Amino acid sequence: QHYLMPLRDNFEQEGIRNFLSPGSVNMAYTEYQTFILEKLNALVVGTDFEQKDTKSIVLATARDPELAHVFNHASMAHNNHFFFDHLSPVPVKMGDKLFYHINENFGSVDTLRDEMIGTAVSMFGPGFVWLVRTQLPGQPVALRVMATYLAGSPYPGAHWRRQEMDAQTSIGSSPQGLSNGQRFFERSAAGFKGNKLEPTAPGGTDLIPILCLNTWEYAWLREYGTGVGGMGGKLAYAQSWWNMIDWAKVEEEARLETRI
Amino acid sequence: PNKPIRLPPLKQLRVRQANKAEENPCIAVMSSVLACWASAGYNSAGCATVENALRACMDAPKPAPKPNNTINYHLSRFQERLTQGKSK
Amino acid sequence: EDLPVIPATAVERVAWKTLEDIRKELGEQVKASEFARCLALVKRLNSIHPDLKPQEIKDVLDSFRRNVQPFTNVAKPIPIDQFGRACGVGKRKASSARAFVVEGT
Amino acid sequence: GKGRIFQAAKVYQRASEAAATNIVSGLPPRNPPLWLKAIESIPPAEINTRPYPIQHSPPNPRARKPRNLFRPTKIVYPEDELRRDFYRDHPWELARPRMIIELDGKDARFLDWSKGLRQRGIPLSGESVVQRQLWLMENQGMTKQEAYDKARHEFYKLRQLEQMERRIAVEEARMVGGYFGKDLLTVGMELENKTYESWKKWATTEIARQESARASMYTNVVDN
Amino acid sequence: DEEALKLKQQIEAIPGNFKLFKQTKAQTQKLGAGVEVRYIPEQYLRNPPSDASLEDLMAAQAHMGHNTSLWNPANARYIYGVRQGIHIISLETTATHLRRAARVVEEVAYRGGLILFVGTRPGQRPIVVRAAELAKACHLFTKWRPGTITNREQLLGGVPLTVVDELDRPLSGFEDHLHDRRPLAPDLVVCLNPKENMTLLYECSLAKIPTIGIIDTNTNPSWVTYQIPANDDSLRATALISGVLGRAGERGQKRRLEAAQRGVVTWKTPADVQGYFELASARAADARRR
Amino acid sequence: QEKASLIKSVDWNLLENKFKNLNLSFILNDASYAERNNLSELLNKLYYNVL
RNA sequence: GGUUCGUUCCAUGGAAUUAACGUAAACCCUUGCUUUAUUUGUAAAUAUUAUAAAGCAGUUCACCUUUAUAUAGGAAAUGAU
Numbered sequence A: 001q002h003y004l005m006p007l008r009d010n011f012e013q014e015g016i017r018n019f020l021s022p023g024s025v026n027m028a029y030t031e032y033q034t035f036i037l038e039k040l041n042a043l044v045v046g047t048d049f050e051q052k053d054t055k056s057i058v059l060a061t062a063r064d065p066e067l068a069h070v071f072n073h074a075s076m077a078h079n080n081h082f083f084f085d086h087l088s089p090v091p092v093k094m095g096d097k098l099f100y101h102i103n104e105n106f107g108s109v110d111t112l113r114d115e116m117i118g119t120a121v122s123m124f125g126p127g128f129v130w131l132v133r134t135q136l137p138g139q140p141v142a143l144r145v146m147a148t149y150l151a152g153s154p155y156p157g158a159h160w161r162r163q164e165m166d167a168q169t170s171i172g173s174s175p176q177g178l179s180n181g182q183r184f185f186e187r188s189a190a191g192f193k194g195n196k197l198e199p200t201a202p203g204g205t206d207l208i209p210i211l212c213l214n215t216w217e218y219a220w221l222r223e224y225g226t227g228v229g230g231m232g233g234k235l236a237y238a239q240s241w242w243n244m245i246d247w248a249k250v251e252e253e254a255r256l257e258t259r260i
Numbered sequence B: 001p002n003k004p005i006r007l008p009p010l011k012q013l014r015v016r017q018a019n020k021a022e023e024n025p026c027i028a029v030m031s032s033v034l035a036c037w038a039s040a041g042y043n044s045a046g047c048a049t050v051e052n053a054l055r056a057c058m059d060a061p062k063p064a065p066k067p068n069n070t071i072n073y074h075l076s077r078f079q080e081r082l083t084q085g086k087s088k
Numbered sequence C: 001e002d003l004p005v006i007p008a009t010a011v012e013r014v015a016w017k018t019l020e021d022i023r024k025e026l027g028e029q030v031k032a033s034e035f036a037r038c039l040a041l042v043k044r045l046n047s048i049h050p051d052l053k054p055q056e057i058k059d060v061l062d063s064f065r066r067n068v069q070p071f072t073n074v075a076k077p078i079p080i081d082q083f084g085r086a087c088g089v090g091k092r093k094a095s096s097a098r099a100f101v102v103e104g105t
Numbered sequence D: 001g002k003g004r005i006f007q008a009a010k011v012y013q014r015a016s017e018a019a020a021t022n023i024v025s026g027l028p029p030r031n032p033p034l035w036l037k038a039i040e041s042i043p044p045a046e047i048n049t050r051p052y053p054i055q056h057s058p059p060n061p062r063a064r065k066p067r068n069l070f071r072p073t074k075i076v077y078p079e080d081e082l083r084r085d086f087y088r089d090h091p092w093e094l095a096r097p098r099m100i101i102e103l104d105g106k107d108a109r110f111l112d113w114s115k116g117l118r119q120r121g122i123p124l125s126g127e128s129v130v131q132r133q134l135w136l137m138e139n140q141g142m143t144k145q146e147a148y149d150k151a152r153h154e155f156y157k158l159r160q161l162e163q164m165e166r167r168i169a170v171e172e173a174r175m176v177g178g179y180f181g182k183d184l185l186t187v188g189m190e191l192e193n194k195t196y197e198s199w200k201k202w203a204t205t206e207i208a209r210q211e212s213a214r215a216s217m218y219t220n221v222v223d224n
Numbered sequence E: 001d002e003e004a005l006k007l008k009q010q011i012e013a014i015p016g017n018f019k020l021f022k023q024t025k026a027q028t029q030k031l032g033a034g035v036e037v038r039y040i041p042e043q044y045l046r047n048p049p050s051d052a053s054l055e056d057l058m059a060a061q062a063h064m065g066h067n068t069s070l071w072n073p074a075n076a077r078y079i080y081g082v083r084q085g086i087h088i089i090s091l092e093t094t095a096t097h098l099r100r101a102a103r104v105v106e107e108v109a110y111r112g113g114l115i116l117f118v119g120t121r122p123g124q125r126p127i128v129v130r131a132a133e134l135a136k137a138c139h140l141f142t143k144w145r146p147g148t149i150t151n152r153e154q155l156l157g158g159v160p161l162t163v164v165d166e167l168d169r170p171l172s173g174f175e176d177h178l179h180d181r182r183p184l185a186p187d188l189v190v191c192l193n194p195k196e197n198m199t200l201l202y203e204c205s206l207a208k209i210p211t212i213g214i215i216d217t218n219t220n221p222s223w224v225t226y227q228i229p230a231n232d233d234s235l236r237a238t239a240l241i242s243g244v245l246g247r248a249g250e251r252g253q254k255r256r257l258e259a260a261q262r263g264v265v266t267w268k269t270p271a272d273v274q275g276y277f278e279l280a281s282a283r284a285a286d287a288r289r290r
Numbered sequence F: 001q002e003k004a005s006l007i008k009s010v011d012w013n014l015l016e017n018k019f020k021n022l023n024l025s026f027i028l029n030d031a032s033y034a035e036r037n038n039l040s041e042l043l044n045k046l047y048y049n050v051l
Numbered sequence G: 001g002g003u004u005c006g007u008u009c010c011a012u013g014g015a016a017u018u019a020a021c022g023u024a025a026a027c028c029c030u031u032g033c034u035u036u037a038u039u040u041g042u043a044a045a046u047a048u049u050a051u052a053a054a055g056c057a058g059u060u061c062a063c064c065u066u067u068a069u070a071u072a073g074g075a076a077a078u079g080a081u
């Protein structure tokens, strides 16, 4: 059975000093993750996924319309830990190679800072904000930001449940509504028929999630509260999160090609 | 009604003619020709269309032999298991 | 086994040794069925990508190559004399002819 | 006598005597086989001795001349009668696949049936209802029917939630831009088409074939 | 042109994608939660167990006997009962007999004995070969040629041999002995399917060779010396038994070689090689005198 | 091996296949290697010389 | 049990593993081709009949079909040769 694993640097017992109190990290990971695994175990209690990894379940149950509920828990248990793992105990200085490459794709570190933070609040819903590494067969290693909804997988193999745009406030009668609507139908029809919309290299090497940001309610609703009057809230949570990013690990997981 | 018995121990569980015996098709056309002569006549016109079919049959090339049936090989694998055993 | 493979149509044609060659070099009587499955491994290991293929498999695959060259016997073409007469030779059961064919009437 | 004299159990007794003395009288016996001393103190077990097998059920006491006294008996438990009652009331519960391939055999170590139907390691199936029923019927002193109702209703409330998740999980995914593949209903219909077409080819071929038999019955070779 | 040129790019991009895919597989493959992997199909080969418990034997289907109709009442001593129309072999009888054979395979290897693991079935080749590696024995995964023991002089005629000392390192000077010496015979055979090959087990009883076999409900238990009541038709129960017996031989060879380093040989020269020594001295005596 | 047959293959070591033009002019006229003109040098590379 | 001109070949058998002879292969004549030699044979000739030493060649390649996936077979003036 899938069991909980300790966090990176004892965040469960002590928790990050200036980001999340130990009581919050306790309810965020030790209690919630345990709840998800308890539900996940019961779903794969007697199936082939009884010994498979969360990521292996995410890719295997991505398109299956009958295993969508199993994908949520598997995709949620993965993204949740993917977020806490990248957090560092203390501030880390951004690497030269990483810092120099970010400026080529976003212009400056402050541009990417306000983009991910802004994208989180602009979503007005639970999900995850990712910093993806886009590398096509011939194109250079280009970075970009992707915002997933409740339980969305940024991996290319799980493109069936990316959940980027809400189909409630993005499909209407306006020019942008019609355009978004066609895409929503073009994907569903193609996906159902099996046709591939965008080519992807084998092995799912096109996109490699480097950094993540958990914007769910349970993560910050206790530490920073609702955020009435601008004091605290989801906005402050995202801002404070920018001070504990393990840029060292983020740089390693990027695996940028030597271009300096 | 009783069910099929368990065969006694045999020397070999096989079928004599595995692949069916093909019958010469032109022999059937000849029988039709001989039928016309019996009823219509020999130097008649009703057997014209039938006599022509008999000439076209013997002219056409005979078919090719079919691949042998592998029934007897599988019968030899399950003999001791299906029957009482092998005797010799 | 985890290394990638190459589609069959992109695998260079190789002349593998036959059942008789293995029997002779090994001095044994290897069953055709047991060798048929051993040859499949040779064809499978040959599908590995060249750049990724290791040096161990390369040497093991070089011992199964058949270096047999059939004898070449190319007939000589019939020349044409300066005057334009070609000499063809034909025989039938007792005799031998020599026809000198030229452009004419 | 189609059998052969197998002396595999006396390889030591035989080898021990052949190695005690030398064939060439007047010389010491050569060293024995390397295995003679290894199994010196490991004799074989007694084979071919029919004992009274374990009796898994009270044997018939009224029998005065009982037979089959050396026949292994059937293993029957109190659960066998409950499994038959449940699965007969829920025949389609057998369609739900169940794996009978054990991983390490240590599955009955985490099964505490005083908690509920949901246990660690095993899936929620007709067995969990049986094991839960047997517990209540024995520990709580409930009757077969009483325990059956209680354990049976807990099974439904858990299965209902399973079917509700599939529906909502899909509907919830499309509200945020989540598309899926071909459902089982569509795939099932496409397969029937490929099979129905093959049947159509077989029907038209045989139908035409029967026409020849109907025309061949009568004779019209004269061409009157 | 542009069609076949695509393959050139893909074929050339496999190395890069493979390396990148291998690196990425080490980053996010294990992040969600720890999986309690308690069974892998290829676990009895990569790391077989030293001793098999009742849970391991049961999980490996080592108790599934044949149909009640197809049974040998001789081996009614290892049957526990009847279920699903088959005979259920006692899990305790299978463990006690398996632990005994492990003690036999261990001592024979401790005395420098030649063991032979014989399993001749479609999928029993990797199991027997792995067991032999551990126990430093010989393997056999094809039809045993009748007469390889009783008629070994002919069958195993041209097969080469070698003479080794206490520490299994070859000795020089036995060139003339390896040409007149007759072929070897296994000091212990371990058959994984005695019901199939009875010609091998008969040559062992006819040549006074101990044997170990997996006796199924329909197998005659009088064909081997040490029976192992278990299911021989299961490919998962045979890999467990072979692993145990394989580890036994390994543990036996370790003691033998570890004792040789201390100048303690656990075996004496066989009779065959012993006779050659006496003849050597006789021929050497002539050189001394003459 | 005693009863095994032989596969018909060209033996390029034979003196007939090595030089398809047996004329010493072509063989020695710097066909492939240079300054092997001496007939003795050519023979030494084909026969085992005792001297 | 299949297959083969063939106890040929493959598979298999609770007994097989092998040796000799016949068989097969090879040999002589004959057939196409290459190189060699040109008299007493050849009109001429830049070599082509003949003479005769050696070497190569087949069911080989292509096409069609193919069992247990192990061993292959068919088509015969309108594929090559």
Ligand SMILES: [K+]
Pocket: none
């Ligand atoms: K000539």
Ligand SMILES: [Mg+2]
Pocket: E066, E195, E216, E218, E232, E233
């Ligand atoms: Mg059996």
Ligand SMILES: [Mg+2]
Pocket: none
């Ligand atoms: Mg034979």
Ligand SMILES: [Mg+2]
Pocket: none
């Ligand atoms: Mg002959």
